[PDB]
Scaffold this active site. Structure first.
Site: not given
Lengths: 579, 583
Positions: A70, A189
């Site tokens: 992605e 993240y």
């Protein structure tokens, strides 16, 4: 030897030709993404001669797809690179151009993210279902300094409420986090992609290339490098690099290689640069077929052997054993690519994801997670076909399981003991296909290729600061480490952007290139992004609803609201739905 | 019909060719920066045929008495739209390089900064040069202005939102002179300025964030754009005065139908369809400029030229087209009107300048690094000397000094007249007096050793006049099909006028909206939303003080600091605050 920047001035500006680059050479250990990206920057920004760039590759000169490719708009370094790589599909356009137009006409988003009970959509799909306790643990992790998170597991900083939330379902499967993984990386993240928090559950922030990464990213780069005279050398196995680590400098002196079965040595000067992609998540991969499991393995190949041989020359070159040893046997190991033209399977997928899998557009829009699967299995169907020469009536489904030592719900074996058709059978069972049809559909209507990857979870293993070498270690003259086992601030590994960033920072630092490198996108420092994060993490609630059942919080909000009532602050909070 | 973005993805991406652009044309009213920028976007991103692009310039195809330099051409790195444009404009000075490349390399070789920002008492440096000398009251007024919604600042003056402490600070000295803010100017625009450039607050006093082209803007920005446009077949039509544009305003549409012009003395008419785009640079700060010379003042004037007449004619066709009278009428007679360019090769003058600015003005590098303010001058005069020479045909032993005065109706300290009554040599004399030149040499050095051209601009302060929302038309007014307003009198969010970036932004937003170009336009830089920038601003505005030093004299603040520091005592927040020197 480098500086970080942002904005169009540094983005559009070209650096001067670096000093003395005409007398310098570069050796890249591997042919992965990071090495290819570093060679591109050496050509474009270093202006180094292609004949002086040597890409050392160990290999000589059904369908299997890879997941986790992605992209997002704020892959700042990657798009800096790929605006300069010509497309192989559209004339007078870059790879970014092709990517940019494609994802505009076919924007990615999911209409069904989580299923359970053999094919039913999770009723709360879309919501995070985080309690106030779980939200506080999220913020508390973010407020913890990275320096205080050495070897801390994800289970050390989150309790029951978080691990029962829908958020953890979306999060752990889309990023392949295991409960025992690095909380330090989890925190990275959380802050790195904060600007896309409203697109987490529906994958509306994801963007995909037209084909598989090899066709859409690697081949355009290789053509770009070949058109500039870059040396692609094959059958080269790097065993060690002799490095002098003195009180004042680190200088690579010799590359000890096996070249086509002959022991050789590449003598290096201070002007010969070495770029090491230390560690590998694909090394020692094994493959099965429709009737054979991929054989489990623990073998250390050339990449892990080389990093170990570099680590015994200085602790500043990292600690590979933290990433390639003591990988829990429950960890993700097996992925599978299931190819079929069977209309019943294709129609079953359409009934779940609400899109025609053969239409050529978005299908599942990212992985669908089977929430109640014993394997913790997810699967995705990208735009079909993902291969240029694949028949137009076929789809290829990518499947992976987060737990490798648990019996399946239909195939009562761990995934590591399962053939391709057996993995397909367990997947079809959780799709809702009738148990009387599943065996033949997998055995005779489909072809499923399983892959066993011992180190696929290695990026996320618990780590301490210093376990990863700096991109350019302290006092290093001609040695750099790149890829997703190298150390740079803030950015998140297991992304292609991290490979490009470390490649960029390595080339810029070693050659002292006088141009800014784009900082990791500033979204954790953006008040507008933080406001959206509060709104989304609380499942679309006002500051009033968030604090309604807390005395200390409701009191602090009251005094805050009285101060900002007539102000731009209130207009900002209203605009971002917090008031 | 457009969207804002940031980051490399949208910066590097190219838009698809807009639909049906092959059947469209464009007319641009003016030859200023905004008109040329819009033409460049029409070529590059609209992919419109150059032969279908018509630039209508009033003047025929600089005063002969001497060189004249313009001010207000400072640049910064975060002119996001301008660098998007000029990375595509080939340099006329360097092969295989854009205007951006040349600019980028030059300002790295020779970075701009001031070694003397404020002088007083005829050439002595201000003792507190460098500090803001802002009291807590003044700092709170700055914050409270920024926390005020723009919707609440209609017609509010700067004097309405600030008091004595602020106007006595060094900050106001630096601020009002570098931007040419008058006390009666728009507080709404000052607020925009405060947040727009917040990332550069640490470089406000020494000008270390400013960046300059090698030459004057016509040579360095205009000519490269003209060469780019002409190489694509763009039509440059001269002797064209636009008197009016007939616009049909209906319930659902606004369509320009006809451009009423005077082409070379002949009344003419350009018929327009919906597929013919019109870009109007409404209003002008240089219109009706007059020029003097060494012996003659620039004659004052109140005349409206073609630009203000055109906007007035458009304004009576729809209230959505703005109110030009708020900017071109009722301009106070104290306002800045006169600028002067003083050129000399005299060693005595140049040595005096070197002794103040600490650099050789003839070396070819940075000289003053921006304006030097004469704080105790009755005219409130400032002057700057950019990299010399600023003209390619100028002798190498010459410098040209730009001089301007914020007060136009006050007798000078040496020439006891208002600046509007002063010839070129008289303005030079007042300037030489404040440099510390011996009074027995001033007359000879200004009259015979120097050539000074004064300029009177009635509308040079017009950008900053107090305005209400609606006084400036939207770049593309509601339901406008083929009409756009560009330049520093058009309306767009957040950005600051009297900057070249604003001209390029409006040009970009006009072309992208009228043609529906499918690419992001970079938002105004997000510095007022960046926690790191806000932390730096607190530190800099308080003259480099800790949070502990800032709150030591308070009770409702020293208490909150203790409770705040206890809650963050082991956290990432404290690390950030220490990193930005707040702890």
């Amino acid at each position: 030897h480098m500086y970080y920047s942002y904005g169009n001035y540094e983005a559009f500006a070209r650096p001067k030709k670096p000093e003395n680059v005409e007398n310098k050479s570069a050796y890249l250990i591997g042919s992965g993404l990071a090495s290819l990206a570093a060679a591109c920057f050496l050509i474009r920004d270093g202006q180094m001669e292609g004949s002086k760039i040597h890409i050392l590759e160990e290999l000589p000169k059904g369908y299997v797809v890879r997941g986790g490719r992605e992209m997002e708009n704020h892959f700042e370094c990657l798009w800096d690179l790929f605006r300069s790589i010509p497309s192989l599909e559209i004339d007078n356009a870059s790879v970014l151009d092709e990517f940019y137009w494609l994802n505009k006409e076919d924007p990615n988003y999911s209409r069904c993210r989580v299923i359970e009970k053999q094919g039913q959509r999770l009723v709360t799909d879309g919501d995070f279902t985080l309690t106030k306790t779980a939200i506080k643990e999220i913020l508390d992790l973010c407020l913890t300094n990275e320096e205080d998170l050495d070897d801390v597991k994800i289970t050390d900083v989150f309790s029951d409420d978080f691990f029962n939330s829908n958020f953890w379902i979306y999060w752990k499967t889309m990023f392949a986090f295991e409960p025992w993984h690095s909380a330090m990386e989890m925190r990275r993240y959380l802050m790195r992609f904060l600007h896309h928090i409203s697109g987490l559950a529906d994958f509306s922030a994801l963007k995909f290339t037209k084909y598989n990464q090899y066709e859409s990213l690697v081949l355009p780069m290789v053509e770009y490098l070949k058109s500039h005279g870059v040396q692609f050398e094959y059958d080269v196995k790097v065993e060690d690099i002799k490095i002098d680590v003195t009180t004042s400098q680190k200088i690579a002196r010799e590359i000890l290689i096996d070249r086509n079965g002959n022991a050789e040595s590449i003598k290096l000067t201070i002007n010969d640069l070495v770029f090491v992609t230390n560690g590998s998540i694909t090394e020692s991969s094994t493959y099965g077929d429709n009737d054979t499991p991929a054989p489990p393995t623990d073998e250390l190949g050339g990449s892990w052997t080389l990093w170990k041989n570099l680590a015994r020359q200085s602790p500043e070159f990292g600690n590979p054993d933290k990433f390639c040893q003591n990988i829990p046997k429950k960890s993700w190991f097996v992925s599978a690519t299931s190819t079929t033209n069977n209309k019943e399977i294709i129609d079953t997928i359409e009934s779940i994801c609400k899109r025609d899998p053969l239409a050529g557009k978005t299908v599942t829009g990212g992985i669908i997670t089977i929430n109640d699967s014993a394997w913790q299995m997810s699967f995705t169907i990208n735009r079909q076909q993902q291969f240029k020469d694949q028949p137009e009536n076929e789809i290829s489904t990518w499947i992976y399981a987060l737990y490798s030592d648990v019996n399946g719900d239909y195939i009562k074996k761990p995934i590591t003991e399962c053939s391709g058709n057996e993995i397909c059978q367990e997947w079809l069972y959780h799709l809702g296909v009738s148990t009387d049809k599943i065996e033949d559909l997998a055995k005779h209507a489909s072809n499923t290729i399983p892959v066993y990857m011992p180190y696929i979870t290695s990026y996320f293993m618990t780590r301490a600061i210093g376990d990863r070498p700096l991109v350019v270690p302290h006092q290093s003259q001609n040695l750099a480490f790149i890829g997703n086992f190298a150390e740079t601030e803030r950015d998140t590994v297991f992304t292609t952007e991290y490979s490009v960033r470390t490649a960029m920072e390595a080339v810029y630092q070693l050659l002292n290139i006088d141009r800014g490198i784009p900082e990791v996108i500033n979204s954790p420092f953006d008040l507008r992004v933080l406001m959206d994060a509060i709104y989304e993490l609380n499942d679309h609630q006002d500051l009033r609803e968030i604090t309604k059942d807390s005395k200390m919080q409701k009191l602090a909000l009251a005094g805050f609201l009285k101060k900002i009532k007539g102000t731009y602050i209130e207009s900002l909070l209203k605009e971002h739905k917090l008031l």
